[PDB]
C-alpha cells in the first residue's frame, strides 16, 4: 500500500504571505462548487487552514520542526447543500521538513579531565560529545565533526568521535601542569556553511 496521504512542509518559513501546504481534492469534484472540503484535527482551523471550495491548505504561523515535526489532520469532502459525504473521513499527515537551524551543543560549558605526564602519544584524555537537534536521518544537518581550536600540538581530537588525546611526548608536569583545550563541533560534516559550537576542556597532568 503506497502511502500518499501526507504533505511535506518546510520549516521556519518567513515569507510575507502564508505558506502553501497543498490541495486536498477528490476526483469526484467537477469544479461546480457543490463540494465543501472541511479540515479537522490537530491545528486545523488555526495553524492550518483550507479553502473550502478548492481544497488549498495554508499555514498561518512559522513552524519549528525541532518543536514539532508531524501534524495529524483529517479531511472530508461533503455535499455543500445536504452535508452528505462524498468521500470518507480520511486521515492525512503534514510532515514538517528539516533545515539546518540548530548549532551543535555540548552538555557542559567546561569539561574537566586528566592525563598522566609522560604519557605515550595518542593517550586518551576525555571524549566530548555535542548534540544536534536537527534531523539526523536527512542531510548533514546533524552530522557533527570535531576540531581542536586551542591545545595544539600538545593535543589532538578525533574528528568523528571527539576523543581528545595527547599528541606530544615529554609533557612534563613540572614544566606545565594545566593545559586548556578548546574543541569545536561543526555540523554539515564540519564544512563550509555549517553551524558550530565550542567547549573548553581543562586538563591536568598527574604523577
* Footprint on residues 28-47 left by a second copy (CB under 8 A): 28
For Ca ion, the binding residue among 51, 64, 108, 158 (CB under 5 A) is 64
For a second copy, the binding residue among 40, 72, 79, 90 (CB under 8 A) is 90
Q: What b-and-e string marks burial along 77-106, b requiring 16 or more CB atoms within 10 Å of the CB?
A: bbebeeeeebbeeeebbbebebebebbbeb
Instruction: Choose the one of a second copy, Ca ion, none that binds residue 20, judging by a C-beta under 5 to 8 angstroms depending on kind.
Output: a second copy
For Ca ion, the binding residue among 29, 39, 48, 134 (CB under 5 A) is 134
Cβ nearer to a second copy, comparing 98 with 103:
98
Q: What b-and-e string marks burial along 155-165, b requiring 16 or more CB atoms within 10 Å of the CB?
A: bbbebeebbbb
List the beta bridge partners of residue 196. Answer: 186
Site string for a second copy, 98-137 (x = CB under 8 A): ---------------------------------------x
**Would you list the DSSP string of 70-89?**
EEEEEEEEEETTT--BSS--
For a second copy, the binding residue among 67, 82, 193, 207 (CB under 8 A) is 193
Name the nearest CA neighbour of 94 among 43, 26, 46.
43
Name the nearest CA neighbour of 66 among 139, 169, 148, 136.
136
* Footprint on residues 132-191 left by a second copy (CB under 8 A): 137-139
Q: In the complex, which residues of this chain contact a second copy (CB under 8 A)?
A: 1-8, 10, 16-17, 20-28, 54, 56, 75, 77, 87, 90, 92, 95, 97, 137-139, 193
Amino acid at each position: 500500500g503506497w502511502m500518499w496521504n501526507q504533505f511535506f512542509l518546510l520549516e521556519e518559513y518567513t515569507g510575507s504571505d502564508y505558506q502553501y501546504v497543498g490541495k486536498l481534492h477528490s476526483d469526484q469534484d467537477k469544479g461546480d462548487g457543490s463540494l465543501k472540503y472541511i479540515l479537522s484535527g490537530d491545528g486545523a482551523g488555526t495553524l492550518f487552514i483550507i479553502d473550502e471550495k478548492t481544497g488549498d491548505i495554508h499555514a498561518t504561523r512559522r513552524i519549528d520542526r525541532e518543536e514539532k515535526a508531524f501534524y495529524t489532520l483529517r479531511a472530508q469532502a461533503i455535499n455543500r447543500r445536504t452535508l452528505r459525504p462524498v468521500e470518507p473521513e480520511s486521515e492525512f499527515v503534514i510532515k514538517i521538513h528539516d533545515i539546518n537551524d540548530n548549532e551543535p551543543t555540548f552538555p557542559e560549558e567546561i569539561y574537566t579531565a586528566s592525563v598522566p605526564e609522560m604519557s605515550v602519544v595518542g593517550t586518551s584524555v576525555v571524549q566530548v560529545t555535542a548534540t544536534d537537534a536537527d534531523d539526523p536521518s536527512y542531510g548533514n544537518s546533524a552530522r557533527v565533526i570535531y576540531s581542536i581550536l586551542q591545545g595544539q600540538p600538545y593535543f589532538s581530537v578525533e574528528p568523528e568521535t571527539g576523543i581528545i588525546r595527547t599528541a606530544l611526548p615529554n609533557m612534563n608536569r613540572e614544566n606545565k601542569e594545566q593545559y586548556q583545550v578548546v574543541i569545536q563541533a561543526k555540523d554539515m560534516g564540519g564544512q563550509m556553511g555549517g553551524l558550530s559550537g565550542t567547549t573548553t576542556v581543562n586538563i591536568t597532568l598527574t604523577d
